[model samples]
Structures are given as C-alpha cells and as structure tokens.
Target: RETDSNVVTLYVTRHGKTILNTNHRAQGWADSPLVEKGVEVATNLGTGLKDIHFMNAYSSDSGRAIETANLVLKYSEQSKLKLEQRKKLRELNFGIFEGEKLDNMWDAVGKAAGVTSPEELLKFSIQEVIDLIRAADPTKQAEDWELFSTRIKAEIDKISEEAAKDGGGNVLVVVHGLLITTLIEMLDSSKTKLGVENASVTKIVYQDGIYTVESVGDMSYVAKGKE
Candidate 1:
C-alpha cells in the first residue's frame, strides 16, 4: 500500500436564505442578502463546525455566499480565517433560462431532449437535466456540463493540492444550491438525489485525487449548535 498525506476534508455548504429562494425563481448569477434566519443558520453551522480547525474559508463572489461564510467563521470563533471569494466558486450561469416557471423550464428541456413530457425529467439525474436545459436554450447562453464542471473542479483541485502541500486538514467551501450539488454529482452521480437546505453542511473527503462524498445536506450541525 502507498502512503498519502494530501487528505483534505471539505466542509461545503449552500448559502443562507434569500428572497429569490422563497420566490421559487432561478437564482443563478443573481445576488441577494441573507434573511434573518439565514444569519442564524449560518451562525449555527459555524458553531457546529468549531471543533474542526479549518485551513481557510472560501465562498463564491456573491453576496449571500460571502455573507454566510463569514457568519459560519465568526460563530466558529475562527478569527484567523478570512473570507476569500473566487469567480470559479460562483453559481451556475442559467443564461437564457435564468428565471421561468418550473414546468416551463422542464418543457423546454423535454422538447429539446426529444422527450414526451416535462415530468419525464423527474427520472433523469440532475447532471442529465442541466445539460438538457442548455440544449433547449436557443441563445446558447446557458452553461452546459463541461463549462460549469471545469469551473468547479479547478477550484477544489487547486485547493486540495494546497491543503495537501501544507499537510492535511479541513477547509470551508460555501457556494449556492445547484452549484453545490453539481460538485456533489460530479464526485458521485449516484448521490445526486440530494437536498440543500440553507446553511446546510455537505462534506467531501479528498485524497490523492480521489473523492468520497459523505453527509449530504447535514443540518445536524445546526442541531449541534442549538441553544
């Protein structure tokens, strides 16, 4: 057996509550601040995560993401870590299909993918559906699997290498809903059936260029932080 020291545990999560979230609209490339509960939950996530010493914290270059990561770091009492935002960490650019009714979006996908009904998408994996959405878009503005995956994989790959270089430990990566699950799906397509509650914790252990997905949508951390 070979030895590997580059084992970095990633605590990835979605940002807190936002107005667009409640509206049921597509929030890709949209910016919104965390609501009151948003702050509380993110703080709880931080408090829950206090036991783990994070190498650093990262968020997408979006308001709510930056907003949530700070609260988590603050309540976790990790003053040593600062909020770092990056473009690759940003949410999927929905492009032409940005905001539309749920049924409408699926209808486009169904038609483009040569399916009979929108409800048929229910069976396909989230990864399958996203690329279908892009194909449906006449403007070709939407990001398909390759474009989006490249952005996300690059960030974690670089981060894992850096963490492995200094030794092994935990790191914080807070992004948006679909984005989080995209990486989740990327690592393990079988686990695509997932939920991303606001401020929920999703963990992935990466070592030697391999990944293991665990604790998908963990609000238990919030429970652990409760009063």
Candidate 2:
C-alpha cells in the first residue's frame, strides 16, 4: 500500500491569526483566541489539504494553535484524527516582551543595538533582536537561540523518527510564526526574514535522519483551493 517506506512527509504550518497579532502586540508564549478571519484561514487550509491522508497531526501547547488545529481538522477529511500536543512546538518565549506592544519594545531593542527607531530596528536580524533582549533581561530567563534551536530540533527529530516508522505517512504540525520561521532558518539561515503567513504550509521530507525542504511558507493551497 506504500510507495516509499523511508520518506516521511511533514506539512508544517503556522497557527491562525490571533487578536494579539492584529493588535501588533508581542504574542510569544502569550495565549489568545483566533479571530474569525483566523478561523477562515485554517478552514481554507483544511479544504486544500482534504485529499491528503494525514497519518499523524500535532499542535503546539497553546490555545491559538490548538484551536487552529481543531478547525483545520473540522473542515478536512482528517476530522477523526487524534491531534497530539507538544510544548516543544510552542512559540519562542519573548520573556519580558510577551504581551507588550511591538512598537514599544522596538525602542528597547534599538537602544541596546545603537538603533534609534523601529525603522532602524527592522534592519537588524531576528537573532540581533534576540541578543538585545538577552542583554537586557535582568532575570536571564529568556531562551537563547542555542537553547531554542536545540529544543526545536529535539522535537523535530522525535517526530521525524516516529513518522518514518509509521511507513512514511504525512504528518501535520500546527505551530506559531516565529517558531516556524526559526525552524526554516535552522535549515537555511540565509532566509533571515521569512514572513510565515497564517495557515501557510511548509513541506519537508524526512528520510534517514536528514530533512529535505520542499517548500517554505507556501500559501498556494489557500489560493488554488488544493495543494
């Protein structure tokens, strides 16, 4: 019944839009409900992926991600599939920046890096902003890139191995934007400023401990109604 026993397919996606996203607030590890448009995007993604037989599905341990995964399953043929929750799949914890307005935090990050305004801060890499935050944190609890990337790869390795064992079936993982971009960045750091849109799909094939990226932040499904 299977054509490739060694190839495990992964369909990774960012969770739907949240109120914090629309409000321009930092939502890393901040829980929020999906707006109506968010639901629409998830549903559209589901409809597009309806034909694919997903053997396993996962969601970040966040309300927004859980809700989006549920909505995606609801509109797709995989409604009966069990959705597993993984904390490693959660977004990057912004520490003090969580729940703060994005514009307000830019000044703090900019001042630390000799940048004057949000316009100038935008020129810095995400790693630069992360470093600025690390330098500013008095408690020193924020996750560094090394720690964050480690945990992310741990989860990815676990899932990839499991999915591979399951006869190389399709696996769906619904997560957050920063995490999605970070994962892709880990694979290809040259892609520094990726805008992983709501409900966009990123495809990868995992085989024999190696990951091959087929697509990154693809929203073509939503446009054509099928992937």
Candidate 3:
C-alpha cells in the first residue's frame, strides 16, 4: 500500500430502531424514524464512535438513515462529510412483508426460504431468501437470488475500489441490516454470516488493494449516560 495511495477504511452502521424494527416488521425503503429507545441506542452508538475520525459519509436517502448518521456525526464532532444519499443501501426489499406483523412475516419468510424459523432462515442463501419471498408473493418483478447478489456485489465493488484508492481517511456508511451483511461478506469473505444489532458498528479496513472486515457488531453495552 503506497503511502499516498487512496486506501479507504469503512465503518458501516445499521440505523437505529424504527417502529418496524421494534415491532418485528420488515422495513425496506418505506419511510420511518427511530423509536424512543432507538434514539437512545443511536446516542450510545454515537458516543461509542467518538474517537474514530471519518473523512466521508454516506447514507440511504431514507430519513431513518440520515437521522442515525446525523446523530453519529454530531457525537463524533466530525463535520458531516459530503453526504451522499443512495438507495443502494436500502434493506432487502421484503415485498409484501413490509409493514406486516413480524410473526406473520417471519412465518411467511421461513416457509418461502424453506426454513423452519427466522433463526434458521438467517443461514438461508440470500438469493434463496429473495426467491422465497418472490415466489410466495407473485408481485415481484425481480428474478432469482443471482440478481440480488449481483446488485449487492456491484455496490460493494464500487465502494471497495474507492476505499482502496483513498487509503487514509475513514468513511461512514449508514446502511440497512441486510445490506450491511452483504458488505461484510464482500469485505471479509471469511465470516459465515454478518449479524448486526440495531446501531451496531461494523468496520472494514480497505487497504493493500484488498478489503477486510475489522469488526462486526461492536456496540457499547455501558456508556456513561447510556445506561
């Protein structure tokens, strides 16, 4: 890694709780905000990352994401980097599962993914999950898992390339849960899965012309005012 080479480190975070996350509903791009507790969670998260100096920041255009990023940037005292809002970071489109009851949605999702429960469904292939939802609900226009993988992988490739080139300053991307998982898989290629809690921090070091996941789901369990 040349000293002047653009080696970019990335810190990815999932937005704090929304009504959907708390109620177990699948929240895709539909607009929402952090619940009261979610606000607390975000505040804690922001405080936890106060030491990390990020040079650039991006978030989905959604309010939940922007809100979460703002909280983090405020706590970190970093001038919000040129905010780039992109739909690419939206959660996996749950199709009809959006806004539905978590239990009902989980059942339907499990059946579609050929799993017995949501826990089991986590291990199900991402493509398989998409197909399951698409098949169960015929309203989908997208194809099978391969397409989903391609869309996600392409976004990661672009981010990774940029990170490798910008080798020094860190970048913060406020993204959805599933999208964060996809990025983790892209960066490490070692982890079997990426599981992030609300407002958790997942960092990746993009250097040496390669990307590697440095941490997954680092959260502050005990912050001065958080508890």
Candidate 4:
C-alpha cells in the first residue's frame, strides 16, 4: 500500500487529559500524572483500538504522554509495544506563557503575529495558520521557524516510510495536542479548523511522498465521563 513505495497510515492521538487541561492552564513542564478520570478514558481508548494491528507505536518522552501510550497499548493487549520516544513531538515551550490561561497569552502572540487575536488568526487558511505559527514561535532566536518546520515534516516522512516498509499497517503516534495539530496543518491541509481536544484521534495516510489527513477527532474520549 505504498503510495509510490509504501501504503502506510499514521494514527496520531493526543495524550489524555491533565491537570492543566482541566484548569485551562499552559503546562510545558512541571509534569503531573493524569487525573483519575483521565486514566479511565485512556483505558477505554485502548479497548476501542484493540483490533487495529498497529505496526509501531510512539510517544513523546513526557510523563503524561508516555503513561497514556502505555495504558492504551496495554488495554488493547498489543504486547509487542514497539513504542519509540520522540523528543521532537513534545509540546512547544510556552516560555513566560507557561501556567497562564491561553486567552491571556493570545493577545501577546497575536500582536507578535501582527493580528488582533488568535481567534482572528484562526480564520486564516491552513497555510496562513502555518505562517502565523512560524511568526509567534516562543523560542524566538532560540530556533529558526523554517528549520523547525522542516525537521517536523521530515520526521513525519521518516515514520511514514517505516510503516510502508512494514507492510502498510497502522502506526500509533501519541503526542501533545498542539504539536500534533500543527503538524497536521503542515503536512496535510492549509485550512484552519477547530483545535483538537485532549485524547482525540486523527488519521493521516502516507503514500509516495505525500501526507494526507483522512479523518480527525473521530473519537475523542473526554478525560472523564464527567467528574
């Protein structure tokens, strides 16, 4: 199923809910375990995914992401656990925005991007949003936006190639919401859409050298059924 050489699909999902998600706070560091309800949803997600024969699985090296990926794979009873840790998939460094409400930080980044607010910028197409992402990169001089984007897409391409060579099965990529969604915009479309919820699942197919998102957030288990 290789597009030109492999027919592989990347099944990417955000990690389960965290304390910050519930409080609407930014959490780049100071890691915390998932709340009790977060555990349940993640377990159920594993049960739901049991039948899919994922060739490889991966998680960001963060506590929450690593924990979530392990639980899901366990519940699914996929013991092979070919899980790999990828530092590149970690959440962006929020810098001074860490621990603050996103709404408050929006204006600052918006201004940096020459816009009134993030809401206004969301109206942009995917390409436009990518442009905006590059502009507001918190690291500023710490890293180059063009280089970062290139590195991200390159990793996606490498993973896609691996899946194809393995006979084109599913690949589970457990990552943070922001990084996962932003990568989606870069590799697939240019239309800005709703943000991905915690524990949401998205599907992207890779064939030849192209990456295409087939479905997004098809099944998003809330961190809890409800408290």
Candidate 5:
C-alpha cells in the first residue's frame, strides 16, 4: 500500500433488524422482512446521514438488506440513487441452521463445546461458532472460510478501487450482520470481538490501494434519535 491524493470513504452498514432477529433465529442466507424497530432505526440512520452526499450505494441481493438500503435512501433524499445489488454481498450460508431458532440448537451447540446453557452459547467466539456450525451442518453446505472472505474482499475492493480511481467520495454498503463482523475480522484478526448492531455504520477509508478502518459498529445515530 502506498500514499495517494484520492481517498474513498466507505460507510459500511448492517441491514436493519429482521423478523429472524426478533424471532431469535439464525438468519444466514435466510430472508425476512424488517420488524418495526428495524424500520424505525433504518429511518433514523438515513436522517442521521441526510446531509452527506454519497457517490454510490451497494447492497446484498437479500431483500431485507435491499429494503433497508432503499428506506435509508428515501430518508436521505437520495431515493433516486442507484443501489446495486451483488450476490457476493449475501450473508453467510449457515447451511442447515438457516432460519432455525437459536433456542433449538443452543443446547446441542453448547454441549459440543462443553458449555451448559444458551447464555454460554452467546459467549462463543466467532471461531467457536464456526466450529459448532460446521459440526452441525449435515448437508455440508456452508461456504469455506477462505471462500467467504475472498468473495467479500473482492466485492469490497472493486467498490473502493473504483471510487478511489474516480477521485474518491462517500459510498454506502448495506449488508448483513455477521457478514459485516466477519469482514472486519478478516481485515485485522487482532481486533476485539466486534458487535454489529442493525443499522449501525462502520466507516472505512481506501487510499492508494490500502483500506483503513475509521470506526467499527458505530450506532451513535440511533442513540441520538432516542435521546
């Protein structure tokens, strides 16, 4: 990575909370509509960013993410902006766990890791969760870690590179929760466990072919609205 004049600012956001989120179910590659709170928070997110001019926006093909992006755009008065949907931005494929209730699998997953309760399962690290899911995936359909990382990196790199080449500007990327978390983790494995809340913004900058993290999982917008 080298220095350059052009620097693209990326506002990476997780989609609003979905039905699966409220239902305490696994949502990877599973589709669901936004719950009431999801709509509210997404609205706030847009309002919080209304004054900023964005060069472009991107989203996962998942309807929930697309819907959230559109809603945010509407509030930002950018409803006309093109929101490109990419399949590579889709959420992790949780295989057999897709749409399954967390409660239903909590015991089994916990037991596999010598844990005793659902709360314990919540404490599982990302790697631990991956190991548990891999063990439980009967169909073996989940994407391998490297494949998932590579796919997301490719899409993100393309988006940032184009923006930088064009003299740079702010770009919005609407994606799923775990996917957002995983992407940041891949960037710097030394990072602490990142908690990606719905409708939160994680700011990253691209300059001279290098990506830099400005912030991760920032939800101050929603907090201000509630205040």
Candidate 6:
C-alpha cells in the first residue's frame, strides 16, 4: 500500500545468517554462504511478506545479500521483480579483522577504544566503533565512519529518488546487519537499543524527499511467515 502522500516504503532488511555468522566470525567485505537456518528464515520472510506487493527489489553485490533477496523474491508475491545489485550496499571493510573470530577482533577493537570487554564497544556510537576498528587495524584497511556513512547514505538516497520518481511504493532491500543497524541509528540518533537480527526488517519511509525510520529490527514478519 502507498503512504498517505504516495511515498515509498523501503523494507530494508538484513540478510540471513551466514557460515561466518554461525561461527562467530568478523564478516565484513569478505563473504560467506548462508547456512541452512539462514535459508529457512529468509524463506519465511518472503512468505510472510506475500501480502505486500514490492515495486522493486535490490541487494548488495555480495553473494549473501543477493541470495537472500532471491529467496525473498522467490516465495514472496513479487517473484516477477528483478533484483538489482549495488556496490555501496556492501558491508563495511573490517580490514585485517576480515574473517577473523568475532571475539578476537572485538577484543582487539575494544582494547583500542579503552573498553575492557568486547561487548562494551556496543556502548560507543556505531561511528566510534567503526573508527576504533579502523584505528586498531594494523593494516589500516577498515572503513572509517566518514567513508561508510557517505557511501551508504548516497546509495540509499539515490534509490529513494529513483523510486519516488516512478510512483512511490514498497521496495525490498537486502543488506548486512551492521550496515542496516548503523543506518537506523543514522536516520534517528534518538532511537536506542540498535541491534539488527538476521532476516529482520528495518522499514524506512520516504515522503516528500525526506527519510523517516518507521521500525527497526523487526522479526515479526518472519514469525508471521511461520504461520
């Protein structure tokens, strides 16, 4: 359904769990295949979203995001929609930490940020966390907050502008967890407790050339699909 002003509803979503996710690895830039459980939830997500007709669908060029979008389009009512890929939709580069164990990487990044514990890094803003990782990486390869924010926002805005021009409606977007959650916070810093689960939907509404986050980290669609 179109918004009251006939705007676009961008159903931004995190791709399902991947092999690295199950193994508790730092997955950014690098890629992995989705595990079976990932498939189940992604399928359910599509099935659950059958009632909503998607005008367009998109994903990162990453295999994980592409596969997730394919699954969503497969079972959902928008099977006919073609999936477009974008490079900026990719996850941030974790630098030397790419494919490293999550615990080890976070521990190092946390220490660099003066946090004794890995999870404590969560207390820092996502931007700080990203910069910490970049500063901590010996290779200096991780993406800084400036680069990532600009890229993601630009791509999202481009997509929104295109969709708005072609009659605003629903659009499905498959992306990574960290990027999605970071965007949610970027859209509304006042929003708290940002954490994106696999296959979770983060809805953003575009009205009159402005972006507004409607919801974040929603798994109810998957649950509904289970029915």
Which candidate's TM-score is highest? 6
Each candidate's TM vs. the true structure? Answer: 0.90, 0.91, 0.84, 0.81, 0.89, 0.95
RMSD of each: 2.4, 2.7, 2.9, 3.7, 2.5, 2.4
Using lDDT as the measure, name the better of candidate 1 and candidate 6: 6
Give the lowest summed-lDDT range of ten residues in model 2.
133-142
lDDT (Cα, tens digit) per residue for candidate 6, span 71-93: 99988867779999999999998
Stretches of candidate 2 above 4 Å error? 1-5, 190-193
The alpha-carbon lDDT assigned to residue 11 of candidate 2 equals: 89
Identify the runs in model 1 with alpha carbons over 4 angstroms from their true place. 1-3, 99-104, 114-117
- Candidate 4 lDDT tens digits, 33-108: 7888788888878877777778899887889898889988887789667789887766665656667786766666
Clashes of each: 0, 0, 8, 8, 0, 0
Best by lDDT: 6
Q: In candidate 3, what are the lDDT values of residues 1-227, reduced to their tens digit?
A: 46445667778788888887877776775658899998888887777777777777888888999998988787667754667787766667767666777688668767766776778966666546666766766577433455556676676566767655565677888888777766665556576255578787777776555677877876752163275
lDDT of each: 0.81, 0.80, 0.71, 0.71, 0.81, 0.88
Report the Cα lDDT for candidate 1: 0.81
Candidate 6 worst ten-residue window by lDDT: 1-10
Error of 5 at 132 (Å): 3.2
| lDDT string, candidate 1, 30-93, tens digits | 7778778778777888888889889878888999898888888888889769778988888887
The positional error of residue 113 in candidate 1, measured at the CA in angstroms, is 3.8
Model 6 pairs whose backbones collide: none
**Which residue runs of candidate 4 sit more than 4 Å off their true CA positions?**
1-5, 28-30, 113-118, 125-147, 190-192, 220-227
